[PDB]
Design a protein around this ligand. Structure first.
Ligand SMILES: [Mg+2]
Ligand SMILES: [Mg+2]
Ligand SMILES: [Mg+2]
Ligand SMILES: [Mg+2]
Ligand SMILES: [Mg+2]
Ligand SMILES: [Mg+2]
Ligand SMILES: [Mg+2]
Ligand SMILES: [Mg+2]
Lengths: 185, 183
């Protein structure tokens, strides 16, 4: 009986660091953990390809969906099956925020593509590290659409999303994630 | 206006030879033609990703779709918009026969993915080079072969099914005769 958790937000919102800290917290409790990430957790070559080329949004989404399809089947589901807590730095919500709200693809089609790609795997909890694009540690209108897109997703699924102020000190954010998670272990 | 034609079949069916002979034939009639193909017509590098070992049928389809989405947008639709005859050696039916009939993916999901990927662009005619599957595992290739025949039965106006074991020049003459009314 595994537990699937995801972290979401702009690049530079603290995803990595908080994924790393949440893993250390679970290691400290003796709970087996698997840290992973998208894009590249399924097809690393999708990540590298897309560093240097820009494609239509449709094609970008489909490449990311291929990668996600492999990631789910070869990494996440097997980790869950072994009773691990599997933490993904980015998952489907990234595509919905970036390719959907950001680049304007229709959300119902994105979700229908995803339904087979993910085999319907949804995280139990998703932590959204929210901040404005100007506060991210690592064009402007686009990033605002993405940030507001994540907030919209979060509003629609208040039982799944936990929204944190990503401008808070690292350590504080980590303790809030822990408090949110304690009931589910 | 533009005219969109595709060729389909198993590898070794002759569909590539016929697509090339068709392009030459239409260009020798002074017709503007654009010859393209999948995979790789949209995203040349897709061919690398498709060679990935142990690739899931879903991931394989999604990669072909990503190429296909780029191919439609950047090559095919602009070609048609300039009034070219655009001929693709393989198009969406290849995925339906290989990833659907061959690898078992559900057709309705394949189609729903395809609806944005392709922007609903359908060929006017599709020439299927029907090749017995042993001439191209074997159980997989039978499924793909029969799948193509099913796709053809389902859309008998679009598909022209040709016997791929006929001499090349007889096949080309048959393709030409199917085209003469639209040209
Ligand atoms: Mg997520
Ligand atoms: Mg997806
Ligand atoms: Mg910034
Ligand atoms: Mg928005
Ligand atoms: Mg497709
Ligand atoms: Mg076709
Ligand atoms: Mg459908
Ligand atoms: Mg059909």
């Amino acid at each position: 009986p595994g537990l699937f958790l995801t972290l979401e937000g702009l690049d530079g919102s603290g995803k990595t660091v908080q994924a790393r800290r949440l893993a250390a917290f679970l290691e400290a409790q003796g709970r087996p953990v698997l840290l992973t990430r998208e894009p590249g957790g399924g097809l690393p070559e999708v990540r590298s390809l897309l560093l240097t080329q820009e494609l239509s949004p449709e094609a970008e989404y489909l490449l990311f969906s291929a990668d996600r399809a492999e990631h789910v089947r070869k990494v996440i589901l097997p980790g869950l099956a072994a009773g691990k807590v599997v933490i993904s730095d980015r998952y489907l919500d990234s595509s919905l925020a970036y390719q959907g709200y950001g680049r304007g693809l229709p959300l119902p089609w994105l979700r229908e593509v995803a339904r087979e790609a993910t085999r319907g795997l949804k995280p139990r909890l998703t932590f959204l590290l929210d901040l404005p694009p100007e506060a991210a540690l690592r064009g402007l209108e686009f990033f605002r659409r993405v940030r507001e897109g994540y907030l919209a997703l979060a509003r629609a699924e208040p039982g799944r999303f936990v929204v944190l102020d990503a401008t808070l000190p690292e350590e504080e954010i980590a303790r809030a994630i822990q408090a949110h998670l304690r009931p589910l272990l």
